[PDB]
Amino acid sequence: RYRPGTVALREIRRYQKSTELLIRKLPFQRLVREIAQDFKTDLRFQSSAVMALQEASEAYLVALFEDTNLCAIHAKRVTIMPKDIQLARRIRGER
Amino acid sequence: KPHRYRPGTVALREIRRYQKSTELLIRKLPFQRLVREIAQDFKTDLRFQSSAVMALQEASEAYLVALFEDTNLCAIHAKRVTIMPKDIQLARRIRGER
Amino acid sequence: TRKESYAIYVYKVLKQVHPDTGISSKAMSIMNSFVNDVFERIAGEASRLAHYNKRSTITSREIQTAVRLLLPGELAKHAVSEGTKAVTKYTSA
Amino acid sequence: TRKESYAIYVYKVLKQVHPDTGISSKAMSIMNSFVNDVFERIAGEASRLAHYNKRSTITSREIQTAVRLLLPGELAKHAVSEGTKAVTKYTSA
Amino acid sequence: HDPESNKKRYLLKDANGKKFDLEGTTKRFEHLLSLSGLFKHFIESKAAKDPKFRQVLDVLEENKESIEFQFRESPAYVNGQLRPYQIQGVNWLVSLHKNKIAGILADEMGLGKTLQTISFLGYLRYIEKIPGPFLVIAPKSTLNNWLREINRWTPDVNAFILQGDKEERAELIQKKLLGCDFDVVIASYEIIIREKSPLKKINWEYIIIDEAHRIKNEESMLSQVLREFTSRNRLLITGTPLQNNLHELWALLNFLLPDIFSDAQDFDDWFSSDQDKIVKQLHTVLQPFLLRRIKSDVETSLLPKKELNLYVGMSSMQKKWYKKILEKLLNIMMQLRKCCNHPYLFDGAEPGPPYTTDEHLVYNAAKLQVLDKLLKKLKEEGSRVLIFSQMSRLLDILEDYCYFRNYEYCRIDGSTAHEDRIQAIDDYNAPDSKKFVFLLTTRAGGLGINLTSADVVVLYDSDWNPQADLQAMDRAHRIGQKKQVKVFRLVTDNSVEEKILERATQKLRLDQLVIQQNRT
Amino acid sequence: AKAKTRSSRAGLQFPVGRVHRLLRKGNYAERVGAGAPVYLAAVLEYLTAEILELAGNAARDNKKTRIIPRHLQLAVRNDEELNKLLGRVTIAQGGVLPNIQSVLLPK
Amino acid sequence: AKAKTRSSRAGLQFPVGRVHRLLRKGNYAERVGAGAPVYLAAVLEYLTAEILELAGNAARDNKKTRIIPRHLQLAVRNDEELNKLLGRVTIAQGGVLPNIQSVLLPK
Amino acid sequence: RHRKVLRDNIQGITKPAIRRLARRGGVKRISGLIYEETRGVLKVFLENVIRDAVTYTEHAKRKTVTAMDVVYALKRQGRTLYGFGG
Amino acid sequence: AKRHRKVLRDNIQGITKPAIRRLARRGGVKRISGLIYEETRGVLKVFLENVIRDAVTYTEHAKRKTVTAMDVVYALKRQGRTLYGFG
DNA sequence: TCGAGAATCCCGGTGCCGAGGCCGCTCAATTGGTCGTAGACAGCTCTAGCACCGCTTAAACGCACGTACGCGCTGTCCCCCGCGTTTTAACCGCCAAGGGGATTACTCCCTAGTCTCCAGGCACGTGTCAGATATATACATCCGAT
DNA sequence: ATCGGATGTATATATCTGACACGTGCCTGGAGACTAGGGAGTAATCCCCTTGGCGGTTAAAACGCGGGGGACAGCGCGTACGTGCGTTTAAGCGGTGCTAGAGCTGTCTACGACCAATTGAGCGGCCTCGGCACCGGGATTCTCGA
Ligand SMILES: Nc1ncnc2c1ncn2[C@@H]1O[C@H](COP(=O)(O)OP(=O)(O)O)[C@@H](O)[C@H]1O
Ligand SMILES: [Mg+2]
């Protein structure tokens, strides 16, 4: 057994070195269609359109988690919390 | 024993007083000297308009007040009530300015 | 010496919602800046919209779509209603 | 049909900055988007500049000032140098 | 009197007493047209708006006891006696009052004008049985002198200075002003501007202004404030009317009598544009309004001064900096005047970072070379010297030079506080003082400074306004100078200093031709 | 015939003709339709009326009858829609909303 | 009267005629000067070469011949001027810079 | 595209996916309440972007949403994206 | 040796500590650490340098030597901080 | 846990200045009439988006065990606040001169736009190979428990 | 400190697929006239900004002191996260068919541009009188030490 944090650090190094997409594709496609059906019914999507949506959303989430990590460290902590997320995207101006 | 207010109760009164008003909080002559010195490194022999200096001061103080609000939020997040240079740095780093 | 501004029209609008209220010159200048900024935003979005579809004309359709893109939520619905009412009245007259 | 790309010019520049390297299709698409983005940014700033100064034409002075506004520091210096060099070489011919 | 009657009469008996007084303006125009027929132009120009003044004019024209109370044998009520020309001035003031016209007392400084003014006020209170209120606006430095003079020659009057901190001023206002327990008020320019409201609500019998040339830009806030005041008559005391312009004289006159000299365009078109001989003779338009005496036919013991212009040529670094300025931090024509004084006034012109005060100081500036040679020469004779300059940084440089050559100095510029100002004046003016030079900015200290011990003045830097330099000379030419004053203006040849000198000479010629010619 | 302004023909207060001129001379497109100035003038009028009603309410709350930049700021920052539309705008001489964090209060 | 492109006449690689046409048909101004396309093409070519050399250096660092979006991202993010120019830009199939806060590393 | 209504698809953004995103962000420990907050923020962001993209596709009188519509929506929200045209 | 300047403490020090305290009070902060003032002065200097650089670029493109309120407003809008009230 | 007492709000009185209201004029909106070309509409075609279906296999899920970390509590300094006393710098008012910059005409020239032909340059469609995956395979190199 | 595992990390070989080179043609950039209007240069007027001085009032700013309360460190503890292991499951991949709808072509109106003539709307200038700022003074509230 590895002590807690070792596998997490190896995972950080693994995912900060790759470039792939970290969310599954079919679940995200279903999500965007379900969201879109609240604006106009019987809508069709280009595969490129869904791919661009996934890239943008994943970049947004990764860049948000960096700020959340900074907020958690600022409070002498290593665990990120919903209050950290709220502080991050309240300082950014998305509140 | 002469009357004395406990620490903090005058700071809160000042907070209310200054959040109720609208006038500028920095002195015009020092601010004008500062901007005139800063502009000397981009083009010497520059003239200024009074409205230009006024616009610079309004923008600067709005920026600083917003920064202090964010700094206060960081300080409270860290379970404190005193704002610190680390809080200022965190606020400017999250906003994307550093 | 002639500087055009929206002050006269803003005052006409003010005397309709608050018939007994005045306005200072600083608030007038802020209102003029606000009107110019909103005009620029809507016109720029409409220009981009016409460019995206290879159109040479800016029409009320482009203005409506730009308004829906820029204004948030409840503001956009009422703005679209007002614009449509004005266009129908004008084209009927 | 017949969409323009910038791909061949980007490849020409690449084949002289790094004569023996290549480039992937997705990377080339990214490079094309970068060129178009910078073009529209500089042109928009130059247009706004000419409108501010009440001029009808866009000239190399507007392009130079837009470059100085948009680029950071050393990039702005070297880009100004290259643009001026090209303009002088073109005029003296 | 009693505070009740003074409350009844001093205060504004009506809400708005400022209106068109027909009798006063009729008498004014009658006396004016009796004096001469030149003022018809002013009356016609002002008649283009109000037909009441025009109807007064034509009524007076179609109809076509000045008691000679010369007040000789100086007033008994005034303590002691005073000189005959003072009697003549008091008689002039009485004639002005009985003819319902104002005037400008323009005796030269030191002749004594406060005594004449307070004697005139004593005449009013005693021979005309009319006490105050009387407003007296003076520079802040002279309020105590005014109070002492009033308490000395006519002691039995009420005079309180309105000076003091805000609370003291308010309590004084309530105790005396609104209480109407006074006769004469002494106030400063800043006090008049500040305590405007409690002072407007008084029916003033007179507004005396010492050093009235201060009120010469009729757009100055003091002018606007003084216009809102309500008074019966006004008086101006100043030794330098028409400093550098005819418009300023018109502004003084417009304050004095705003109905006569109501148009500045008329006064400018009067002379500004033989061609300049007969029009000069038309200065009888100002003959009854101005009285000026010269301290040469009255006094005597003050030998006159001799002025020499010492021309110098720029040095090598001066030439370099002059060319660098001329063809091209540096944001005005004054940079040319800095270079003509000393190149060290620009940062970096002084050689090298580890600065040493040595001969290069005098070496690098030609004015300083000539000044050094002349200073040594005068030091042979033991004469004491006053240095004047438009700039105080040049006074710093001169201080360093003077210390480097072991001379004893004392500085008075705008920075030095009033107490040490008096201290330095006393040190220099000690009967056995060992101080040699007195560094001094030209426009400093007002008029209270009395450096009579010195007998040599050098104007290291001339001024746009010739009257400022004339006052600077007067700081040593003041009454009591038993020696002979010797003045030296340093002029840099073939530079902008010649242009400044030419402009100042034009202005001085204007003053001499207009006011100093027929002053008698 | 008799001239009638397009503003009156559309029942508006804002200048349809001036909006048309600015659209034509602003380098926005090669041609401008007939209904675009009308639509844009109507939208501008609506937004102006909205913000002015809120500002007048604020002025009357402060026991004054004249709108000032403070009242404009109070109107804008107290409404979520206008606060979103004007998020990056700073109103000169406007001040801030009075707001003290509850952790900072006594006891 | 053999033709000679203004792109070759200026010594550039990017097209000057195409840039001129895009400026002329982009609704930027009523008129377009003669040297504006040349200046703009020179600036664009300079920026392209600037980013491309850094991307090629990164590709050589990873021992690869072709340039991929990962190399473009590495170049842009590791160069400070380019990172400030492309601050609000997402590069698809790029990634992040390897960076771990020091507080998280084991003692 | 006929008679299809979907629900609860936000739960398809699984906890391991959020954890991978946090790891690429450089996060070592994750609180158990972070996943619902993440789902909320993702849904809000996606709603805004899709609203703008659908507005563009409606103006073009189309029924298909294109990558260029998505790119325009992101660019107007201030999140320029390279690699899908433009 | 007084002909030398030996005067004029730095112009950034003209943003006195009471002024920064007033700005903090308007921002709603209660206790201020002693090291906040130097940090605030540095932040303000950086902001002013950016804005003034852009404004000077505008005015020198216009071929003037006077910075105007319009130049400052354009510079601010270009940074992304629109300012209402100066035209 | 009730008085001191200090700060704040709420009243009247001034007073002053800027917001509204009126008048003249001029210049941009409006009206009427060509004209030409964008876009609106109808028709076609072919592509790519959608709906399935089957199959494999990683990835997600649920559960357990147990550290280590987040949180509460307790002292301890020490640093920041409240307050009083100096003192000093901002803030008005002034003086001088001169240039910068905005208007408002004028003159004029040269540099753009607008056409007409007409060749080359570039986009598109192909047909190869070599650089970049995929698998194994052995090595070295951290990590964690004795 | 040393040893036993588990995890990258190079290293070699085989595939394939996508990047690059080559050929067509067509449409767009270039050459060449011709023209008109945009912008540069000139001149006059008036108002604002700079520089280096002066004088004065008067709040803020700076400084020192005391003391209180907040920061910071240390300790304990008890959950709640991480790690790892079976177990489903549903995502990804490949293949197929179907049809909607995206994109292109051709016609031809109808609607925008443009021009000339006319005239009302809006801008600048001028004047005044209420709204708001300021100033005592008096009641009210809130803090503090009992
Ligand atoms: N007995 C006297 N008779 C005349 N003048 C006197 C007498 N005593 C003193 N003086 C002078 O009167 C002068 C007052 O006038 P002055 O100082 O010239 O005032 P200002 O400078 O305002 O003209 C004093 O300087 C003083 O020397
Ligand atoms: Mg005197």
JSON list of N, CA and C (backbone and C1' of nucleotides) in Angstrom, two decimals, chain E residues 140 166 169 334 391-392 414 421 441 443 445, chain K residues 50-59 136:
[
{"chain": "E", "resi": 140, "resn": "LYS", "atom": "N", "xyz": [-1.67, 91.70, 5.46]},
{"chain": "E", "resi": 140, "resn": "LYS", "atom": "CA", "xyz": [-1.68, 91.14, 6.81]},
{"chain": "E", "resi": 140, "resn": "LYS", "atom": "C", "xyz": [-0.53, 91.66, 7.65]},
{"chain": "E", "resi": 166, "resn": "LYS", "atom": "N", "xyz": [-10.50, 80.83, 13.60]},
{"chain": "E", "resi": 166, "resn": "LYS", "atom": "CA", "xyz": [-11.91, 80.83, 13.21]},
{"chain": "E", "resi": 166, "resn": "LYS", "atom": "C", "xyz": [-12.82, 81.10, 14.41]},
{"chain": "E", "resi": 169, "resn": "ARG", "atom": "N", "xyz": [-12.38, 84.65, 15.62]},
{"chain": "E", "resi": 169, "resn": "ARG", "atom": "CA", "xyz": [-13.03, 85.55, 14.68]},
{"chain": "E", "resi": 169, "resn": "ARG", "atom": "C", "xyz": [-14.54, 85.55, 14.86]},
{"chain": "E", "resi": 334, "resn": "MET", "atom": "N", "xyz": [11.59, 80.26, -20.08]},
{"chain": "E", "resi": 334, "resn": "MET", "atom": "CA", "xyz": [12.37, 80.59, -18.88]},
{"chain": "E", "resi": 334, "resn": "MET", "atom": "C", "xyz": [13.65, 79.77, -18.80]},
{"chain": "E", "resi": 391, "resn": "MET", "atom": "N", "xyz": [14.98, 84.09, -8.84]},
{"chain": "E", "resi": 391, "resn": "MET", "atom": "CA", "xyz": [14.99, 82.67, -8.52]},
{"chain": "E", "resi": 391, "resn": "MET", "atom": "C", "xyz": [15.70, 82.45, -7.19]},
{"chain": "E", "resi": 392, "resn": "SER", "atom": "N", "xyz": [15.19, 81.50, -6.41]},
{"chain": "E", "resi": 392, "resn": "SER", "atom": "CA", "xyz": [15.78, 81.17, -5.12]},
{"chain": "E", "resi": 392, "resn": "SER", "atom": "C", "xyz": [16.83, 80.07, -5.22]},
{"chain": "E", "resi": 414, "resn": "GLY", "atom": "N", "xyz": [10.96, 83.14, 0.32]},
{"chain": "E", "resi": 414, "resn": "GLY", "atom": "CA", "xyz": [9.63, 82.75, 0.74]},
{"chain": "E", "resi": 414, "resn": "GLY", "atom": "C", "xyz": [9.59, 81.65, 1.77]},
{"chain": "E", "resi": 421, "resn": "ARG", "atom": "N", "xyz": [12.87, 85.72, 9.85]},
{"chain": "E", "resi": 421, "resn": "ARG", "atom": "CA", "xyz": [13.00, 86.88, 8.97]},
{"chain": "E", "resi": 421, "resn": "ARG", "atom": "C", "xyz": [13.38, 88.12, 9.77]},
{"chain": "E", "resi": 441, "resn": "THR", "atom": "N", "xyz": [15.24, 87.31, -2.45]},
{"chain": "E", "resi": 441, "resn": "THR", "atom": "CA", "xyz": [14.39, 87.27, -3.63]},
{"chain": "E", "resi": 441, "resn": "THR", "atom": "C", "xyz": [13.70, 88.62, -3.81]},
{"chain": "E", "resi": 443, "resn": "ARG", "atom": "N", "xyz": [10.72, 89.71, -4.94]},
{"chain": "E", "resi": 443, "resn": "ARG", "atom": "CA", "xyz": [9.34, 89.92, -4.51]},
{"chain": "E", "resi": 443, "resn": "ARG", "atom": "C", "xyz": [9.07, 89.23, -3.17]},
{"chain": "E", "resi": 445, "resn": "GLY", "atom": "N", "xyz": [8.96, 89.69, 1.36]},
{"chain": "E", "resi": 445, "resn": "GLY", "atom": "CA", "xyz": [8.93, 90.52, 2.54]},
{"chain": "E", "resi": 445, "resn": "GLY", "atom": "C", "xyz": [7.99, 91.70, 2.48]},
{"chain": "K", "resi": 50, "resn": "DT", "atom": "P", "xyz": [0.40, 71.38, -17.52]},
{"chain": "K", "resi": 50, "resn": "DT", "atom": "O5'", "xyz": [1.76, 72.19, -17.54]},
{"chain": "K", "resi": 50, "resn": "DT", "atom": "C5'", "xyz": [2.54, 72.21, -18.72]},
{"chain": "K", "resi": 50, "resn": "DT", "atom": "C4'", "xyz": [3.70, 73.17, -18.58]},
{"chain": "K", "resi": 50, "resn": "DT", "atom": "C3'", "xyz": [4.35, 73.17, -17.20]},
{"chain": "K", "resi": 50, "resn": "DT", "atom": "O3'", "xyz": [5.75, 72.98, -17.33]},
{"chain": "K", "resi": 50, "resn": "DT", "atom": "C1'", "xyz": [3.77, 75.39, -17.86]},
{"chain": "K", "resi": 51, "resn": "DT", "atom": "P", "xyz": [6.62, 72.53, -16.06]},
{"chain": "K", "resi": 51, "resn": "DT", "atom": "O5'", "xyz": [7.85, 73.55, -16.09]},
{"chain": "K", "resi": 51, "resn": "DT", "atom": "C5'", "xyz": [7.71, 74.78, -16.77]},
{"chain": "K", "resi": 51, "resn": "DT", "atom": "C4'", "xyz": [8.57, 75.84, -16.12]},
{"chain": "K", "resi": 51, "resn": "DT", "atom": "C3'", "xyz": [8.96, 75.56, -14.69]},
{"chain": "K", "resi": 51, "resn": "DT", "atom": "O3'", "xyz": [10.20, 76.16, -14.40]},
{"chain": "K", "resi": 51, "resn": "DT", "atom": "C1'", "xyz": [7.55, 77.45, -14.75]},
{"chain": "K", "resi": 52, "resn": "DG", "atom": "P", "xyz": [11.22, 75.45, -13.39]},
{"chain": "K", "resi": 52, "resn": "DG", "atom": "O5'", "xyz": [11.64, 76.62, -12.40]},
{"chain": "K", "resi": 52, "resn": "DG", "atom": "C5'", "xyz": [11.93, 77.90, -12.92]},
{"chain": "K", "resi": 52, "resn": "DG", "atom": "C4'", "xyz": [11.41, 78.98, -12.00]},
{"chain": "K", "resi": 52, "resn": "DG", "atom": "C3'", "xyz": [11.43, 78.60, -10.52]},
{"chain": "K", "resi": 52, "resn": "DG", "atom": "O3'", "xyz": [12.28, 79.47, -9.79]},
{"chain": "K", "resi": 52, "resn": "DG", "atom": "C1'", "xyz": [9.38, 79.61, -11.14]},
{"chain": "K", "resi": 53, "resn": "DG", "atom": "P", "xyz": [12.54, 79.21, -8.23]},
{"chain": "K", "resi": 53, "resn": "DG", "atom": "O5'", "xyz": [11.29, 79.91, -7.51]},
{"chain": "K", "resi": 53, "resn": "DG", "atom": "C5'", "xyz": [11.49, 80.97, -6.61]},
{"chain": "K", "resi": 53, "resn": "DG", "atom": "C4'", "xyz": [10.47, 82.07, -6.83]},
{"chain": "K", "resi": 53, "resn": "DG", "atom": "C3'", "xyz": [9.64, 82.41, -5.61]},
{"chain": "K", "resi": 53, "resn": "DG", "atom": "O3'", "xyz": [10.35, 83.29, -4.77]},
{"chain": "K", "resi": 53, "resn": "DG", "atom": "C1'", "xyz": [8.33, 82.43, -7.62]},
{"chain": "K", "resi": 54, "resn": "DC", "atom": "P", "xyz": [10.18, 83.16, -3.18]},
{"chain": "K", "resi": 54, "resn": "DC", "atom": "O5'", "xyz": [8.78, 83.86, -2.90]},
{"chain": "K", "resi": 54, "resn": "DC", "atom": "C5'", "xyz": [8.55, 85.18, -3.31]},
{"chain": "K", "resi": 54, "resn": "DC", "atom": "C4'", "xyz": [7.11, 85.56, -3.08]},
{"chain": "K", "resi": 54, "resn": "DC", "atom": "C3'", "xyz": [6.61, 85.28, -1.67]},
{"chain": "K", "resi": 54, "resn": "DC", "atom": "O3'", "xyz": [6.67, 86.47, -0.89]},
{"chain": "K", "resi": 54, "resn": "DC", "atom": "C1'", "xyz": [5.00, 84.69, -3.37]},
{"chain": "K", "resi": 55, "resn": "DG", "atom": "P", "xyz": [6.60, 86.39, 0.71]},
{"chain": "K", "resi": 55, "resn": "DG", "atom": "O5'", "xyz": [5.05, 86.25, 1.02]},
{"chain": "K", "resi": 55, "resn": "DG", "atom": "C5'", "xyz": [4.13, 87.18, 0.48]},
{"chain": "K", "resi": 55, "resn": "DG", "atom": "C4'", "xyz": [2.72, 86.82, 0.92]},
{"chain": "K", "resi": 55, "resn": "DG", "atom": "C3'", "xyz": [2.64, 86.31, 2.36]},
{"chain": "K", "resi": 55, "resn": "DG", "atom": "O3'", "xyz": [1.60, 86.98, 3.04]},
{"chain": "K", "resi": 55, "resn": "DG", "atom": "C1'", "xyz": [1.60, 84.79, 0.88]},
{"chain": "K", "resi": 56, "resn": "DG", "atom": "P", "xyz": [1.49, 86.86, 4.63]},
{"chain": "K", "resi": 56, "resn": "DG", "atom": "O5'", "xyz": [0.21, 85.93, 4.83]},
{"chain": "K", "resi": 56, "resn": "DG", "atom": "C5'", "xyz": [-0.81, 85.94, 3.85]},
{"chain": "K", "resi": 56, "resn": "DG", "atom": "C4'", "xyz": [-1.86, 84.91, 4.17]},
{"chain": "K", "resi": 56, "resn": "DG", "atom": "C3'", "xyz": [-1.84, 84.40, 5.61]},
{"chain": "K", "resi": 56, "resn": "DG", "atom": "O3'", "xyz": [-3.17, 84.36, 6.09]},
{"chain": "K", "resi": 56, "resn": "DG", "atom": "C1'", "xyz": [-1.76, 82.59, 4.10]},
{"chain": "K", "resi": 57, "resn": "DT", "atom": "P", "xyz": [-3.48, 84.13, 7.65]},
{"chain": "K", "resi": 57, "resn": "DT", "atom": "O5'", "xyz": [-4.56, 82.96, 7.61]},
{"chain": "K", "resi": 57, "resn": "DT", "atom": "C5'", "xyz": [-5.45, 82.90, 6.51]},
{"chain": "K", "resi": 57, "resn": "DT", "atom": "C4'", "xyz": [-6.16, 81.56, 6.44]},
{"chain": "K", "resi": 57, "resn": "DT", "atom": "C3'", "xyz": [-6.45, 80.90, 7.77]},
{"chain": "K", "resi": 57, "resn": "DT", "atom": "O3'", "xyz": [-7.69, 80.24, 7.66]},
{"chain": "K", "resi": 57, "resn": "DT", "atom": "C1'", "xyz": [-5.11, 79.46, 6.47]},
{"chain": "K", "resi": 58, "resn": "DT", "atom": "P", "xyz": [-8.57, 79.91, 8.95]},
{"chain": "K", "resi": 58, "resn": "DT", "atom": "O5'", "xyz": [-8.75, 78.33, 8.84]},
{"chain": "K", "resi": 58, "resn": "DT", "atom": "C5'", "xyz": [-8.52, 77.69, 7.59]},
{"chain": "K", "resi": 58, "resn": "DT", "atom": "C4'", "xyz": [-8.01, 76.29, 7.80]},
{"chain": "K", "resi": 58, "resn": "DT", "atom": "C3'", "xyz": [-8.14, 75.79, 9.24]},
{"chain": "K", "resi": 58, "resn": "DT", "atom": "O3'", "xyz": [-8.78, 74.54, 9.24]},
{"chain": "K", "resi": 58, "resn": "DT", "atom": "C1'", "xyz": [-5.97, 75.40, 8.43]},
{"chain": "K", "resi": 59, "resn": "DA", "atom": "P", "xyz": [-10.31, 74.41, 9.71]},
{"chain": "K", "resi": 59, "resn": "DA", "atom": "O5'", "xyz": [-10.68, 72.91, 9.33]},
{"chain": "K", "resi": 59, "resn": "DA", "atom": "C5'", "xyz": [-9.79, 71.88, 9.66]},
{"chain": "K", "resi": 59, "resn": "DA", "atom": "C4'", "xyz": [-9.24, 71.22, 8.42]},
{"chain": "K", "resi": 59, "resn": "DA", "atom": "C3'", "xyz": [-9.05, 69.73, 8.54]},
{"chain": "K", "resi": 59, "resn": "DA", "atom": "O3'", "xyz": [-8.98, 69.16, 7.25]},
{"chain": "K", "resi": 59, "resn": "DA", "atom": "C1'", "xyz": [-6.94, 70.79, 8.58]},
{"chain": "K", "resi": 136, "resn": "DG", "atom": "P", "xyz": [-22.08, 77.90, 12.94]},
{"chain": "K", "resi": 136, "resn": "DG", "atom": "O5'", "xyz": [-22.78, 76.66, 13.66]},
{"chain": "K", "resi": 136, "resn": "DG", "atom": "C5'", "xyz": [-22.99, 76.68, 15.06]},
{"chain": "K", "resi": 136, "resn": "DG", "atom": "C4'", "xyz": [-24.29, 77.38, 15.41]},
{"chain": "K", "resi": 136, "resn": "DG", "atom": "C3'", "xyz": [-24.92, 76.95, 16.71]},
{"chain": "K", "resi": 136, "resn": "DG", "atom": "O3'", "xyz": [-25.78, 77.97, 17.19]},
{"chain": "K", "resi": 136, "resn": "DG", "atom": "C1'", "xyz": [-26.19, 76.12, 14.89]}
]
